[PDB]
Design a protein around this ligand. Structure first.
Ligand SMILES: Cc1cn([C@H]2C[C@H](O)[C@@H](COP(=O)(O)OP(=O)(O)O[C@H]3O[C@H](C)[C@@H](N)[C@H](O)[C@H]3O)O2)c(=O)[nH]c1=O
Ligand SMILES: Nc1nc(=O)c2c([nH]1)NC[C@@H](CNc1ccc(C(=O)N[C@@H](CCC(=O)O)C(=O)O)cc1)N2C=O
Ligand SMILES: Cc1cn([C@H]2C[C@H](O)[C@@H](COP(=O)(O)OP(=O)(O)O)O2)c(=O)[nH]c1=O
Ligand SMILES: O=S(=O)(O)CCCN1CCN(CCO)CC1
Ligand SMILES: O=S(=O)(O)CCCN1CCN(CCO)CC1
Ligand SMILES: [Cl-]
Ligand SMILES: [Cl-]
Ligand SMILES: [Cl-]
Ligand SMILES: [K+]
Ligand SMILES: [Li+]
Ligand code: NA
Ligand code: NA
Ligand code: NA
Ligand code: NA
Lengths: 234, 235
């Protein structure tokens, strides 16, 4: 690779974009793009499936953040690809890890890994845990994860740039959540039974700033959105 | 007796006190005090238990506009006393009625009644139901209760003043909740089992603006306060 690694950053996430802009300031020989479905205003857009040859020619590393789908096989063939996933691989791989970890008690955190042909699966370069508190919501754990992502990436950047790491596969496969798994959690069945703790975990997992995630339908057919506000005694 | 009725209002609640002040424009011979329990800024105090004899001598009618001090027998027995109560008697008498009605499905509303030795008991002069929607909390219901209280009082004030009504006791005793019943409800047991509906009713019942009412203790012993935000979908 040597001393001049040309880097393509791909992300649709607002925090990771901001981090990428800081990396570009440090690195220089870097372009930062979003996908055809990103919502970052003014950020150049790249359809990776259609631009493979061009990417393989121009860049020495592709560094994605919070990637949701597989890369083209040819891209993997042609160029080193690394992803930054805001989960603790291999637990709750896939969509919105802290939502699922609030519910199931698995670790959450940030994982830098090589990209293979399974989602959030390839060999791990670096990772960092984020402890979840009994008062946390999705929103509050996520803000900490974004801080962790920044710290972790900045710590390991030169090694990622230089390829001077040796990544290691996780010992187990873990589990994967899909977009549809999140959507399925949103509907609250008023007749569902459980413990109060189970229900509070559900609510706090679906609480993320003012997103209208959780809803129920009342006996008259009216939909009602729900979120919780949790505050530890101090 | 119209203007010849000399009225005392005892009130410990900001909304009820504002209503009392408004009534003072409609009726000259009316005094407004808070009890020793009140924390209303600038409002003069009257200790009802110490001042019973003078109250009975000087007034023709005593109104409790959410007075927190219990009226002793000598007061209630010696002058007509009327309560304006933010519950629908005889259901969930006593403390914070809408909290308990959100959970149990009993009616809530406002009741104006003559006072006797029991709490929120006695002949009903007027009352009005407040509906509770699936998205309501204690705070949202209570705000409507204060609007209902103002409506009902303004409607019935002349009859109340003059004692011209024919009041009727409720046919059943209903049920009574005290401050301790609310303190106990506050604490959420994480191992309690129930329906999601039942749980949401508990949380919204304990949700009232930014009051830190509901709490649980986590596995490590840390207390955590909880409230819910419910928003119905707009058409
Ligand atoms: C102090 C306190 C209040 N609240 C809410 C629920 C309450 O219904 C509402 C108003 O509270 P408050 O203390 O102004 O209570 P009031 O509305 O003045 O009524 C209380 O006193 C009257 C003398 C009695 N007739 C009532 O039955 C009793 O509920 O605020 C809370 O949710 N938590 C609280 O700690
Ligand atoms: N005779 C009488 N009947 C009433 O219905 C009545 C009065 N007086 N006076 C004004 C007001 C008093 N209302 C109440 C309502 C609830 C409690 C109550 O829960 N008491 C608790 C102790 C409360 C504390 O520790 O702060 C108890 O355990 O008795 C007390 C007074 N009131 C109607 O509105
Ligand atoms: C899109 C979306 C996100 N979120 C929360 C959970 C996500 O972890 C967080 C960040 O969302 P987003 O930036 O879409 O996801 P990512 O971290 O995968 O780039 O926002 C919701 O709660 N509801 C939603 O509908
Ligand atoms: O209520 S909706 O889910 O339909 C719209 C969500 C709007 N907000 C999402 C969260 N951002 C803040 C970042 O989480 C503000 C806009
Ligand atoms: O958090 S505490 O419950 O100790 C105190 C909260 C005080 N707030 C009560 C609600 N009012 C608004 C009126 O309902 C504002 C202050
Ligand atoms: Cl949040
Ligand atoms: Cl169960
Ligand atoms: Cl409220
Ligand atoms: K290949
Ligand atoms: Li009362
Ligand atoms: Na290349
Ligand atoms: Na008189
Ligand atoms: Na005086
Ligand atoms: Na008298």
């Amino acid at each position: 690779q040597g001393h001049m690694v040309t880097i393509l950053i791909l992300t649709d996430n607002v925090h990771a974009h901001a981090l990428a802009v800081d990396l570009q300031a440090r690195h220089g020989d870097m372009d930062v793009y979003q996908s055809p479905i990103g919502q970052l205003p003014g950020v150049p857009r790249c359809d990776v499936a259609e631009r493979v040859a061009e990417i393989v020619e121009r860049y020495d590393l592709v560094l994605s953040f919070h990637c949701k789908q597989r890369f083209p096989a040819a891209l993997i063939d042609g160029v080193r690809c690394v992803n930054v996933h805001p989960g603790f691989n291999p637990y709750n791989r896939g969509w919105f890890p802290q939502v699922f970890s609030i519910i199931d008690g698995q670790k959450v955190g940030v994982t830098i890994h090589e990209i293979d042909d399974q989602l959030d699966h390839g060999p791990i370069i670096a990772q960092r845990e984020c402890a979840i508190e009994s008062w946390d919501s999705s929103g509050s754990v996520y803000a900490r994860l974004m801080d962790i992502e920044r710290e972790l990436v900045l710590e390991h950047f030169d090694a990622i740039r230089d390829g001077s790491y040796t990544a290691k596969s996780p010992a187990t496969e873990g589990n994967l959540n899909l977009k549809k798994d999140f959507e399925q959690l949103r509907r609250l069945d008023l007749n569902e039974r459980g413990t109060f703790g189970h229900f509070l975990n559900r609510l706090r997992a679906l609480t993320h700033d003012d997103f209208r995630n959780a809803w129920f339908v009342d006996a008259s057919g009216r939909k009602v959105f729900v979120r919780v506000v949790l505050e530890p005694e101090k």
